From Swiss-Prot, chain A:
Organism this protein belongs to: Saccharomyces cerevisiae (strain ATCC 204508 / S288c) (Baker's yeast)
Disulfide-bonded cysteines: none
The protein's assembly and partners: [Alpha(6)beta(6)] hexamers of two multifunctional subunits (alpha and beta).
Protein name: Fatty acid synthase subunit beta
Described function: Fatty acid synthetase catalyzes the formation of long-chain fatty acids from acetyl-CoA, malonyl-CoA and NADPH. The beta subunit contains domains for: [acyl-carrier-protein] acetyltransferase and malonyltransferase, S-acyl fatty acid synthase thioesterase, enoyl-[acyl-carrier-protein] reductase, and 3-hydroxypalmitoyl-[acyl-carrier-protein] dehydratase.
Additional free-text comment from the UniProt record: Present with 91800 molecules/cell in log phase SD medium.
Homology family: Belongs to the fungal fatty acid synthetase subunit beta family.
Top-level taxonomic group: Eukaryota
From Swiss-Prot, chain D:
Record's protein name: Fatty acid synthase subunit alpha
Gene: FAS2
Positions in coiled-coil regions: none
The species this protein was found in: Saccharomyces cerevisiae (strain ATCC 204508 / S288c)
Residues covered by the Ketosynthase family 3 (KS3) domain: 247-576
Active site: C429
Full protein: residues contained: 872 to 1452 of 1887
Tree of life domain: Eukaryota
Modified-residue entries (Phosphoserine), positions: S82, S564
Length: 128, 72, 183, 576, 242, 145
């Protein structure tokens, strides 16, 4: 199918609550950032993963500081951007997605004003 | 249980077996505390006889001498 | 406002220096090991003063055990605790039988106001350029300024350079001939 | 003197006058107590100018005032000019070019963590213990603690340790406390139009940000946990100030008759006989009950009591929010709820998410429960002895819940499903350690390979009063008389220690064979390397503490010249 | 082999009268009496208890040869939580584990003034403030109850266990534990948020008609079911050659 | 005896000094709290020298009755519930902040403030005089700063 199961990490089937913040960010870039045209296939999808990385910072920071993704333009070099965020919050590579952030992620997938996400994040009632 | 039937009959016109229904509906809705006012107890018997009313399907001076005789 | 507040039963008395001393020291100790106090900080000297102010035959066996049982090898911080420790142990041995003493070692400060380039008024308390010891403060006082007209000594301190060295100095009574009054 | 209007201090000083820090004036004042100036005072009153020349500056008032004005003006013009040159920029050069030039602040959210233990690189590990130790130990007989949890005055093991070790909560502190206490409730859906995912004030249903939980709740969270005044709402209305009690009196003259059912009137006549008349009211079928002179009556009265403070589970705790079914809530004694919640939280601490995972590694018969209680079921006990005595509605099996070993029974019946050992300790104020002893032994005998250990007890009205009668607990009226806040009435080893503060809760840990723990791959929080119980001596005071437990140090020194090869690991290892 | 491991590693001091229980308890991991760093006192805040308990802890240190100058640092957690009779020992057992794994010894913050009587017990140190140390090796939870119910427990730091195991094995272990922590962090934030933490089991791992067969086969163990996915006993794993 | 030695004051700096030198000191506090009790235990466990002792009492220098009650509790034998002491120094630094009060504003506050800062200080010196005198204490003056 043209919409893969999102929470599949390098061929390994799994669920959204059994991915790490890194795995999700890398899966996001994988499926929305078109490598061949070095371009985010849709600006909302770049906007999406930005909102997500921002959340990564929010969760894992201890005190208040300022975002390492000041502008989402920085996502135009996705790999470099991702490494910047997770370098600062290394812990985020090792921990599964917080239960409450799962709800969040799935909520963003439901945002109108965004090109419908190119996958299935969840097996549930609205699976059709 | 004496006074509670003479109220159910005076102010809500209920005979022997019809006030038996209103007491059984009040037994399923029994207060988790004792009612304070006699007017609170009267108001309780009111709504209980109207929950009986729509479960069965039916709709809704000598006392001066009484005070003296007590005295005697 | 004239209502009563004092009752005898609400009085609280504090006694146990004998115990707070072991704590006082076992704290300076982990704090140096963890490098909160480095050998420059005046606090190690202050705290030395307070530990000496409570020499027991017992407080000694405490530092003695804990200092002699530190592995100098373990790290650079560990040597420091041990060296300072041993120095402190020495001093306490001398103080033993000597009445405490109030000696302020804090770095002397003065007023500094500064208004921003954006009108932000800020106040700091800076170290006085020409004053470092309470010793130097007394000298400053005796000289006065030009504003007091009509009438009606250099003892180089190891101060903010090497705390352990200053700590070794603590027990020694300063002899002076050039009385500050004569300045 | 400057301390916690100093802004002009630098300025006044700019005139050859000295201002002072408080440490400086204090040094100056203290100098008047030196023997030298003390004797001076004894000869004739002394006057000390500790005013650093500020007595030479003319028109000091106006001079002072000027410095202040010049400062304040320089501040206000400087700040007003800048605020205008800044608006002139937004006009000339657009507010959309300056909008993409502010930075974005990021605000922290709470990431509560399980706080497992840290595993070092093996290189460092082998440096801790002697190299000889490797394979010396039968790991099937090393008792290890695998998880733990508690329900208590200060929340759970997580929030309590935080308060005990640090004295204030973190973000994860408040957020968890606010959650257990019921202040905030999770929400995920639409909040008045827009979608939301996060905390919500459960009273108002408005959204709450993690970074705000402290400002909004902690002030109150703190007021309603720990050792505080007894909140009667938490104890079916127990009010230490107004103790309920009935007195017996003989009715001196015939009471006035009252209406009653036939069944009920007969229960009266059965009791009183010659001293009561009951008669049928022919019209209604019901009886009149008239208590004659001579009869016995119980007339309620009230008593003011001394113990006004307890260590109570944080206000708003609710077995419902840990996820316990209403049916269980009803059926069970409060203490079982404490226990249930901690057994759950303790398995979580051990990374056992489904108890039946044990049965992947072990046989049904080798998981045990050695948790115990001092009293346990104090609440069902009352319903049995007192609430029955009043003919109040009380369950038909409150007897069940009053037993001490039924807490462990519900644990096994709701969660664990084991056919392992079930040894239940009663050790008063040490049932918990004795429980570990019993636990350790049951695993060392092969009877169990995993078992639940711990203790639990509840605080109720009749409990606290009887302790007060034994003079065991601290007298709150007296504590107040001494200036003691509730948070200050438990002070061990203190000069003024005055009696113990009563509390409620439960705490269990999971213990295991070291060998099994390693194989399952659960956390290892410590080694239970010894556990002992010991009685004291002949006496007559039951509530007395003794030195029985000193026997755990018993060794024989009648000969200690030369080293015992036995103590030497290098030796033992060769022999092995 | 297991019995030999036992004789020389685990229980070498059992039949020895020159090695105390407390001694040997520590001794099996290469620990000395001085290594017992923290004493978790029962600290009832009663006059009777606190003195006795100090005296008795003092003496068990004195008899075993605790180095003069190395006192045990005593915590008194009843000051914060109060005294829940039965649940006392456990709460202290928790704080003891938390102490071991953090190196932090909390302070009796209600010690305005240590009772002058207690000065005689030179082997006890009563801190009023928290000490963040560079390590704690062993805690001693002691508790007393009505009816001469006395009790002690010695908890030794976890890292001493890993010494007695092969490196390949230790590494394999760290792997499993890591995966659990991740899956438990998962579970915990689920049940917090959704109040799913307690989930009552509505069935045993065995069908009623399989109950006895399980109790009697010592090798019977649970496997994930296909249909339900939950952990049950299978007919094919009960009394199997496999 | 030292009044006015609350936190962040010339008082508390003098108090730390006294304690460091091994003095036996009574401190008065007006706002007697756990928060304040905890402050002094901290201060004592830092500077409390060998032979030192700190005694914190709640006190209101504005009450005649408190002035009298205090220095009576100081002189009274331990048996009688007292301190059994005899003062060598008195440092009556207790006060109330009056600001923005000019001549025609002088009222309830300032009259009360004047009482704490003068009349009751007199009363306090007077009190310890009677005690010493009633005990024939003619060779141990108390120094009043
Ligand atoms: C429940 C009651 C038993 C517990 C108490 O009766 C005491 O043993 C507790 C104690 N004094 O340490």
């Amino acid at each position: 199918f043209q919409k893969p199961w999102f929470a599949t990490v390098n061929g390994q089937a799994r669920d959204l609550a059994t991915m790490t913040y890194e795995e999700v960010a890398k899966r996001l870039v994988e499926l929305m950032f078109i490598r061949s045209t070095n371009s985010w296939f849709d600006v909302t999808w770049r906007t999406f993963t930005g909102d997500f990385l921002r959340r990564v910072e929010e969760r894992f920071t201890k005190s208040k500081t300022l975002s390492l993704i000041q502008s989402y333009s920085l996502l135009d070099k996705p790999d470099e951007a991702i490494e910047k965020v997770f370098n600062a919050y290394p812990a985020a590579r090792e921990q599964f997605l917080n239960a409450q952030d799962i709800d969040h992620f799935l909520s963003m997938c439901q945002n109108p004003m965004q090109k419908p996400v190119p996958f299935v994040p969840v097996l549930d009632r609205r699976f059709e | 249980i004496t006074v509670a039937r003479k109220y159910l009959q005076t102010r809500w016109g209920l005979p022997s077996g019809r006030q038996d229904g209103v007491l059984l509906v009040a037994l399923s809705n029994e207060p988790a505390a004792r009612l304070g006012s006699e007017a609170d107890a009267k108001a309780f018997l009111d709504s209980m006889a109207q929950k009986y009313a729509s479960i069965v399907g039916v709709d809704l001076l000598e006392e001066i001498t009484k005070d003296h005789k007590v005295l005697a | 406002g004239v209502a009563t507040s004092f009752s005898r039963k609400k009085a609280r008395t504090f006694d146990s220096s004998w115990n707070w001393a072991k704590q006082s020291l076992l704290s300076l100790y982990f704090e140096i090991i963890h490098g909160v106090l480095k050998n420059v900080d005046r606090e190690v000297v202050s705290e030395a003063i307070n530990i000496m102010n409570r020499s027991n035959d017992a407080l000694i066996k405490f530092m003695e055990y804990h200092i002699s049982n530190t592995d100098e090898t373990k790290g650079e911080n560990y040597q420091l605790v041990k060296t300072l420790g041993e120095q402190l142990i020495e001093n306490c041995k001398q103080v033993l039988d000597v009445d405490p003493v109030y000696k302020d070692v804090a770095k002397p400060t003065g007023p500094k106001t500064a208004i921003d380039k954006n009108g932000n008024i800020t106040y700091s308390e800076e170290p006085r350029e020409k004053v470092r010891k309470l010793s130097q403060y007394v000298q400053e006082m005796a000289l006065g300024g030009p504003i007091t007209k009509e009438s009606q000594m250099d003892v180089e301190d190891a101060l903010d350079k090497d705390s352990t060295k200053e700590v070794a100095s603590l027990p020694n009574k300063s002899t002076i001939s050039k009385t500050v009054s004569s300045t | 003197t400057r301390g916690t209007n100093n802004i002009i201090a630098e300025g006044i000083e700019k005139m050859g006058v000295r201002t002072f820090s408080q440490k400086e004036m204090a040094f100056n004042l203290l100098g008047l107590l030196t023997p030298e100036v003390v004797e001076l005072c004894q000869k004739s009153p002394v006057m000390a100018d500790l005013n650093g020349g500020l007595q030479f500056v003319p028109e000091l008032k106006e001079f002072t005032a000027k410095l202040r004005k010049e400062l304040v003006e320089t501040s206000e013009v400087r700040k007003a000019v800048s605020i205008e040159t800044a608006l002139e920029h937004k006009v000339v050069n657009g507010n959309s070019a300056d909008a993409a030039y502010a930075q974005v602040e990021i605000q922290p959210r709470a990431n509560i963590q399980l706080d497992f233990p840290e595993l070092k690189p093996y290189k460092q590990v082998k440096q801790i213990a002697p190299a000889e130790l490797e394979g010396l130990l039968d790991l099937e007989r090393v008792i290890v603690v695998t998880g733990f949890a508690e329900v208590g005055p200060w929340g759970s093991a997580r929030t309590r340790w935080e308060m005990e070790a640090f004295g204030e909560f973190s973000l994860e502190g408040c957020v968890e406390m606010a959650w257990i206490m019921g202040f905030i409730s999770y929400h995920n859906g639409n909040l008045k139009g827009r979608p939301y995912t996060g905390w919500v004030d459960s009273k108002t249903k408005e959204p709450v940000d993690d970074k705000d939980v402290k400002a909004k709740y902690e002030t109150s969270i703190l007021e309603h946990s720990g050792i505080r005044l007894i909140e009667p709402e938490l104890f079916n209305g127990y009010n230490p100030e107004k103790k309920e009690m009935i007195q017996e009196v003989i009715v001196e003259e015939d009471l006035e008759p009252f209406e009653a059912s036939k069944e009920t009137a007969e229960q009266f006549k059965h009791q009183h006989g010659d001293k009561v008349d009951i008669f049928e009211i022919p019209e209604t079928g019901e009886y009149s009950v008239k208590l004659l002179k001579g009869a016995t009556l119980y007339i309620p009265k009230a008593l003011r009591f001394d113990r006004l403070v307890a260590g109570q589970i944080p206000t708003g705790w609710n077995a419902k929010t840990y996820g316990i079914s209403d049916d269980i809530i009803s059926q069970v004694d409060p203490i079982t709820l404490f226990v249930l919640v901690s057994v759950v939280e303790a398995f979580i601490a051990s990374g056992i998410t489904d108890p039946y995972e044990m049965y992947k590694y072990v046989h049904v018969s080798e998981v045990g429960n050695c948790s115990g209680s001092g009293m346990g079921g104090v609440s069902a006990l009352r319903g049995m002895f007192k609430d029955r005595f009043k003919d109040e509605p009380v369950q038909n099996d409150i007897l069940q819940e009053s037993f001490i070993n039924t807490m462990s029974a519900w644990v096994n019946m709701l969660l664990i499903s084991s056919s392992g050992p079930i040894k239940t300790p009663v050790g008063a104020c040490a049932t918990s350690v004795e429980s570990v002893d019993i636990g350790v032994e049951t695993i060392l005998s092969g009877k169990a390979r995993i078992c639940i250990v711990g203790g639990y007890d509840d605080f109720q009205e009749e409990g606290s009063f009887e302790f007060g009668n034994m003079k065991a607990t601290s007298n709150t009226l007296e504590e107040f008389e001494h200036g003691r806040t509730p948070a200050e009435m438990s002070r061990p080893a203190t000069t003024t220690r005055n009696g113990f503060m009563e509390a409620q809760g439960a705490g269990i840990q999971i213990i295991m064979q070291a060998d099994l723990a390693l194989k399952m791959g659960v956390p290892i929080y410590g080694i239970v390397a010894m556990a002992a119980t010991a009685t004291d001596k002949i006496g007559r005071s039951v509530p007395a503490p003794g030195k029985g437990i000193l026997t755990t140090a018993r060794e024989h020194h009648s000969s200690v010249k030369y080293a015992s090869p036995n103590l030497n690991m290098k030796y033992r290892k060769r022999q092995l | 082999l297991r019995a030999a491991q036992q004789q020389w590693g685990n229980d070498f001091y059992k039949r020895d009268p020159r090695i105390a229980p407390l001694r040997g308890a520590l001794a099996t991991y290469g620990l000395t009496i001085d290594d017992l760093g923290v004493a978790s006192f029962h600290g009832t805040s009663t006059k009777a208890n606190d003195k006795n308990e100090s005296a008795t802890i003092n003496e068990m240190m004195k008899h075993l040869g605790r180095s003069e100058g190395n006192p045990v640092i005593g915590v008194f957690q009843k000051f914060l939580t109060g005294h829940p009779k039965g649940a006392a020992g456990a709460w202290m057992m928790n704080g003891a584990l938390q102490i071991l794994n953090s190196g932090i010894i909390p302070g009796n913050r209600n010690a305005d003034n240590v009772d002058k009587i207690l000065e005689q017990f030179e082997y006890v140190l009563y801190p009023s403030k928290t000490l963040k140390t560079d390590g704690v090796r062993a805690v001693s939870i002691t508790s007393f109850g009505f009816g001469q119910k006395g009790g002690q427990a010695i908890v030794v730091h976890p890292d001493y266990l890993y010494g007695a195991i092969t490196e390949d094995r230790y590494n394999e272990y760290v792997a499993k534990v890591s995966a659990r922590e991740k899956s438990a962090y998962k579970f915990f934030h689920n049940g917090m948020i959704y109040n799913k933490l307690f989930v009552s089991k509505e069935h045993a791992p065995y069908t009623d008609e399989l109950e006895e067969d399980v109790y009697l086969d010592p090798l019977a163990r649970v496997s994930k079911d296909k249909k339900s996915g939950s952990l049950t006993f299978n007919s094919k794993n009960i009394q199997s050659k496999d | 005896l030292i009044t006015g030695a609350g936190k962040g004051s010339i008082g508390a700096e003098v108090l730390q000094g006294l304690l460091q030198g091994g003095a036996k000191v009574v401190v008065t506090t007006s706002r007697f709290s756990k928060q304040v009790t905890d402050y002094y235990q901290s201060i004592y466990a830092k500077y409390g020298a060998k032979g030192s002792t700190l005694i914190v009492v709640p006190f209101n220098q504005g009450s005649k009755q408190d002035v009298e009650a205090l220095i009576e509790f100081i002189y009274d034998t331990e048996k009688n519930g007292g301190l059994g002491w005899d003062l060598d120094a008195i440092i009556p630094f207790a006060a109330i902040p009056e600001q923005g009060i000019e001549l025609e504003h002088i009222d309830s506050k300032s009259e009360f403030a004047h009482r704490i800062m003068l009349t009751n200080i007199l009363r306090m010196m007077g009190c310890v005089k009677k005690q010493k005198s009633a005990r024939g204490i003619e060779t141990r003056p108390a120094q009043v700063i």
